[PDB]
Amino acid sequence: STFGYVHGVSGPVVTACDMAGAAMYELVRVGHSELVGEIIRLEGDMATIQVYEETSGVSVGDPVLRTGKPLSVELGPGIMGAIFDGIQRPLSDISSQTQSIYIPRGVNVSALSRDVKWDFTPCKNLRVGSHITGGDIYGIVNENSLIKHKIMLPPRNRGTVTYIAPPGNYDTSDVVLELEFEGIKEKFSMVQVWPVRQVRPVTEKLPANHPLLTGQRVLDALFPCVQGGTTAIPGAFGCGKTVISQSLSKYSNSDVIIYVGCGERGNEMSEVLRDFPELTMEVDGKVESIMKRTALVANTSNMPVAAREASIYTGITLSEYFRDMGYHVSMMADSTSRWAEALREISGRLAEMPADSGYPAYLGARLASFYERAGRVKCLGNPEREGSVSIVGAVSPPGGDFSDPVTSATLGIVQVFWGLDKKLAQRKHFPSVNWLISYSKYMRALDEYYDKHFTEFVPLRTKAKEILQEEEDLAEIVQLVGKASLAETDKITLEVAKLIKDDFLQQNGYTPYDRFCPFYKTVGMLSNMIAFYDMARRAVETTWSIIREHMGEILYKLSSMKFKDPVKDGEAKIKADYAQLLEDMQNAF
Amino acid sequence: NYLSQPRLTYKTVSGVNGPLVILDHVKFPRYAEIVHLTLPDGTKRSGQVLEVSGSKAVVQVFEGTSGIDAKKTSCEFTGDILRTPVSEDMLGRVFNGSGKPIDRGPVVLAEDFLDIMGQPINPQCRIYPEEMIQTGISAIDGMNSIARGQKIPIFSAAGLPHNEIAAQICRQAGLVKKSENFAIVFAAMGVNMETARFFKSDFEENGSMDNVCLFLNLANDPTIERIITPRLALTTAEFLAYQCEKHVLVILTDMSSYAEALREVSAAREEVPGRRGFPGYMYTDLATIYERAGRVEGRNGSITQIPILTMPNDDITHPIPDLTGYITEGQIYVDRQLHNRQIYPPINVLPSLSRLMKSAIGEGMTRKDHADVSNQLYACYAIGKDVQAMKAVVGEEALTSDDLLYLEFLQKFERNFIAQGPYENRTVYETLDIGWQLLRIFPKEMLKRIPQSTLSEFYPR
């Protein structure tokens, strides 16, 4: 059969009858306006469905149109620069088709429009008669100037090519590839439909070795992240969250970005949806907009609670489809604390047992089964590509306390934590990443890259970490007894720590010279500031005063280092100027 | 989209248990259908259908279930869900919680029939709030200023004057003079007879009822009408704003009496009570009436909300002010400390915050010193409250000449700036001019949060 009838609605939940061949967690369309809901129980012929939309005016006997699939995304061209909700309805098309400001509760508008034409070209290896496995790229759609949309096979099916398309412009409904198999020949277009709860298959997990060049100086040096890794940041009101989310989209080596705003707010999501279309990317030629490589999943809390719980799985499935092409995806879940409040309402409506602070029993397992979808892996398919997914999930704990069933379960799964602080924003220290509470566990896998490319960076930062760790025990005694009892060895390492927090860590994002500090500038700005430290370690073992008053101009040359603009200043000049500062310190001592 | 079929009338009541009336042999019942009960002695009652199952439909009667028979009562099914007669001539009328007029007037002529549940606003169509809403209170306009589309509660307690400053910011709300299509929808849920009489006789006795749409709902009103009261008030405020293009302020007072009515009907549907007795879907249900705010892209209208709530026992970890602080954008505390000290309004600005006040104030909006005089009055208030704790354990003599100036600022800040009186309508310019008369008692170079580019123009007077 194909139709069911309603037989009773008691709120969001509909106990639809006459549905015998219905599967569990399969999406249906309830009512005359076709409200979307999923089958959540199945008692014989009746199927108990909870509706995503608002049931109001749904009669007994309305048709329940079965689809036959779980909650799934449409993967194909027309996705870059598009804004979806958590269940992938196009917000930029709903506001254009209907000419209104509301979501009309019955829109089964397709996520990818079937009216635009895409310039398709085949892989030029595939002929009529070739055997093809799942994951093989059989075409490339030049979607933008930046992104080449490699049309791939679905991982499910397999067969032999009997009809390939000629090079030309097609819709997303035109048949492009046709595959003979044992029983029946299958034909399918450029769009593939993959369930969002199902992990994408892949050949082999690889270890993560290459770092993410985020652009900031404290994050690329002291607490480094790898592409293929999982991080976490505190999601407070204002510490630094707007510039960590936007410098990682402008100034990173990641090929595509997916930004998942997951039930955020009314005006805090309208701020994001109007600031990301007006960002600018500096590619090797001319300037470009960031929305040629960025997709957004936008959810306010007026939206359905199951379109807020499945926003994370929509975002990670778009991040995994662009991983399998060979790109290096970076995904930022804007809030995972507002996602776990969408689990508590889903489980609280099903009368599930609360585990801890109201959250359900499967909270720590659903967070682990999402963060373990991130990693640099070797993709499927005979073209022999590799991809990556990096996940930056922000956590907004109640009251800023790190003891919570979501926050303490995030810190046990993520490896990197960039601890943003409220107090460093009140002292105008930008970016406000704290160094004591932060950590990074990818350092042991990043030495093999650092010994082949920079080779004087690994012992450089461990000296910079023990200086600032020494400063916190020195800060309690400067008000206790004072600097009058402070040692000649300890008063110098306090004075280079103030040089560290002013020159290396503090980085103004609106100045045109420090918007993107590359790692050649980053290794230079610390190698001339740690070499200043240990030559000041033997200068007290031979006077603290005469090194501060006579080298005050050398104190200025380190305090105008961050100014050595690398956009308009060559790399080899900056290396040349940094070597000249190294000789001035070795000659003055 | 008219419907012309005649309505059916059932005398097939098959069960009454509490406020629910269970019918039988119903021909294709809708879910949220509005029915009209007729008692055996002729009295009329209304009711929403609560749950259907086959041919059985369970209605719940609004006005109560007493006297309802099983043989002689007749229930009539109006074939559509609850609608609202909206107009622009509902500006100056007093309605009850179900939409009927109270102020001895006629029914509204219904220039549109709108749904009370509405639809969610598109996140791609919403735009960021920019200009300011003048409330007339210096503690709100000066230091915790609200934008045009900001959602900002008033965290009060039982006994504190949150009804007296709700009626104040309704009589004297305007945009900014700036030398214009303004309306106010006031919804009261769970008020007394004395508070409802105070709200009726303060708006009509002050000339403010040319732009106020007042929705009362008393505590002796049906508890199902407390749920459709903020849905009526925000349906009309979505007709005045971005359908008639006027800036609307919605004041939803006693949002702790709304969720005590939401808990009441959640036990009528036989649901298990969640955290602290409140239902599990209260974050979705509160956010369906808060997120009907903000500005849209193609229309000049705007709608901003001040949902006033009373947190019990001065608790922020209660689910009523915790699930409100997650979705609204900064809070305003009415506190018992300043209220016993006889300061009206008793709004302490040290824990209060407006998250979008950096957008609301500015040069083209109010004037260009609002950002610095708000930061300087807040910094001098924290010091003057800190050194007032030094006045008791150290002494009035041993403190320096600086700390004796902060103590003279403290007795003038909480008496000239915050303490206003219930009928003093200060503009946004009269607020900042009082804000400079309290900063002029300090010498400059103590005013360290104000830059010298703005300290030179406004200090010497």
Partner: peptide, 19 residues
């Protein structure tokens, strides 16, 4: 929560007999 969900499971069974 466990005592109230135990009763709402028992009240459903008694309403499945009286059908």
């Amino acid at each position: 929560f466990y005592r109230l969900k135990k009763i709402q499971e028992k009240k459903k069974i008694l309403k499945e007999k009286s059908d």
